[PDB]
Write an enzyme that holds these catalytic residues in place. Sequence first.
Site, short mmCIF file in Angstrom:
data_model
loop_
_atom_site.label_atom_id
_atom_site.label_comp_id
_atom_site.label_asym_id
_atom_site.label_seq_id
_atom_site.Cartn_x
_atom_site.Cartn_y
_atom_site.Cartn_z
N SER A 128 2.41 27.18 -8.42
CA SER A 128 0.93 27.02 -8.45
C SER A 128 0.44 26.81 -7.00
O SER A 128 0.73 27.67 -6.15
CB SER A 128 0.57 25.90 -9.42
OG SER A 128 -0.83 25.76 -9.53
N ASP A 180 -0.45 31.52 -19.44
CA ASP A 180 -0.90 30.53 -18.44
C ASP A 180 -2.37 30.24 -18.77
O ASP A 180 -3.23 31.16 -18.60
CB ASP A 180 -0.72 31.11 -17.04
CG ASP A 180 -0.90 30.10 -15.93
OD1 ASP A 180 -1.85 29.26 -16.02
OD2 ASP A 180 -0.15 30.23 -14.94
N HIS A 193 2.10 27.74 -17.71
CA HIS A 193 1.83 27.63 -16.25
C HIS A 193 2.99 26.94 -15.53
O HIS A 193 3.45 27.45 -14.47
CB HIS A 193 0.54 26.88 -16.02
CG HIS A 193 0.24 26.74 -14.59
ND1 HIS A 193 -0.06 27.82 -13.78
CD2 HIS A 193 0.20 25.63 -13.82
CE1 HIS A 193 -0.30 27.35 -12.54
NE2 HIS A 193 -0.16 26.00 -12.56
#
Length: 244
Positions: free
Chosen positions: A91, A188, A218
Amino acid sequence: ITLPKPFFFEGGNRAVLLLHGFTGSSADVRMLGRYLQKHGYTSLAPQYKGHAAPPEELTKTGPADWWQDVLDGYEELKAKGYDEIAVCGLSLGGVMSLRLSMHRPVKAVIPMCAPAYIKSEDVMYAGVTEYAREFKKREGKSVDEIEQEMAVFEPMPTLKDLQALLKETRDSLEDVYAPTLVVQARNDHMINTDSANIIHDGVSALQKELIWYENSGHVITLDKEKETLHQDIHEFLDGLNWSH
């Protein structure tokens, strides 16, 4: 509450800098680090200022602090004598990995579920309050204790700087020349998954690939296709032009 600390896992001469996500910790990349250690790669996972700490500390920090933590981790690897360093991140860590490839020599860049679209500040901040509540619930605080603490929880004006970092990184993807493996979870709910195509399409790297993980969310490193991810990263790393 037992807080995660940074890690350094010794393997061979080949090194990977592992970068966690916003509100994450070294826990987000620890199993990947262990996998890499067992397969020949040395890893180092720094932690960002304000992370692995009470959430009120997080709102006093911003991407200028976190970026310095990334550079500090890169430099720690080179200080230990590892001159060939691939960079892999989850991320916000994937964004920091792409930014790092523009600023320092890296053998490869592996952004995992990296955001390349810009969410409203209030949506980002709502993620910080969810994070704070779940922290305080892990502290065994009552629902009144949690509500009292959340009612005085401060704003985080550096989320606008985090928006700026996302926009700058998206706008400067042509500056990425190093071999690039884009990793993206299909299921996600936290980012715009089109970011994987923005990143894959935008880098200048000749050597690049995009892998979709069809049964993951995610936090892909902690999910049921983590084993496959480990092998995919391993094969990618093994195909790079390492000195030995």
